[PDB]
Design a protein around this motif. Structure first.
Motif: not given
Length: 248
Positions: A111-121, A201-203, A230-235, A237-246
């Motif tokens: 839960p400490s890491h709530q800033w996400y980047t998702v990349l698709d090769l 942990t941070s933007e 999806q670059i530096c978002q707090k929400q 989509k990854y592997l079919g889940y919505l990652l939001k609020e931990g």
DNA sequence: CTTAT
DNA sequence: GATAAG
């Protein structure tokens, strides 16, 4: 932009990938296997014309090459070419499946890491070379009744439909990103074959880590989809889940 | 197309 | 004795 700053990392601007640090893959056969040659079922002209520009591009990219092989499996039109490699898969030695299932993979997202980047090769398997000794395994027939060419082609890269491609790719990218993980101990990096999640942990840290990851991926020869990123978002989509609020 | 469920 | 997937 992210696009202009990392031209080599994006599939849109960097060209087709090639994992330059990875040795061409040798595909061991089961101890009793011999080649199987299945004749190509006739294909309609509509399907052949649909498939043809894809074959030509792959030839131009060196991903397909002519060959003569005692192996042959059929190509079917779906138009996109889909090879039925089931009889090849039966004759290839099994490997331990090491790709984690998504549920378990996501358990390592704190839960400490709530800033996400998702990349698709993009075209991930094609980034991995096949050893010339293993290329004939994957041969198929290609007919252009207009140009007159009848003959076989095969893949010079890890092919779609081969039963070990996801695991071999996942293991190869793990080797290539091992140093990145060591150089960035405060970042979380989840790998699911060609689907990557970077968590910070941070933007600011997510921005700096994403910069470093894109630079690394492009240098190694992989290519990410700039369109899907999806670059530096707090929400995300990854592997079919919505990652939001931990959550999830 | 074939083929495993 | 329709189905998803290569």
């Amino acid at each position: 932009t992210w696009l202009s700053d990392f031209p080599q990392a994006w599939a849109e601007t960097g060209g087709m990938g090639l994992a330059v640090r990875q040795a061409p893959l040798i595909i061991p056969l089961k101890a009793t296997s011999t080649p199987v040659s299945i004749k190509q079922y006739p294909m309609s002209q509509e399907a052949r014309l649909g498939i043809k520009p894809h074959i030509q591009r792959l030839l131009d990219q060196g991903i397909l090459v002519p060959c003569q092989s005692p192996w042959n499996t059929p190509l079917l039109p779906v138009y996109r070419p889909v090879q039925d490699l089931r009889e090849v898969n039966k004759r290839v030695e099994d490997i331990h499946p090491t790709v984690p299932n998504p549920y378990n993979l996501l358990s390592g997202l704190p839960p400490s890491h709530q800033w996400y980047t998702v990349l698709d090769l993009k075209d991930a398997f094609f980034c991995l070379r096949l050893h010339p000794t293993s290329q004939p395994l994957f041969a198929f027939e290609w007919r252009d009744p207009e140009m007159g060419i009848s003959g076989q082609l095969t893949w010079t890269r890890l092919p779609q439909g081969f039963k070990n491609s996801p695991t071999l790719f996942d293991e190869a990218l793990h080797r290539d990103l091992a140093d990145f993980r060591i150089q960035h101990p405060d970042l979380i990096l989840l790998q699911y074959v060609d689907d990557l999640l970077l968590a910070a942990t941070s933007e600011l840290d997510c921005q700096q880590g994403t910069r470093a990851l894109l630079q690394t991926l492009g240098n190694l020869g992989y290519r990410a989809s700039a369109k899907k990123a999806q670059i530096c978002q707090k929400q995300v989509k990854y592997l079919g889940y919505l990652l939001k609020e931990g959550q999830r």
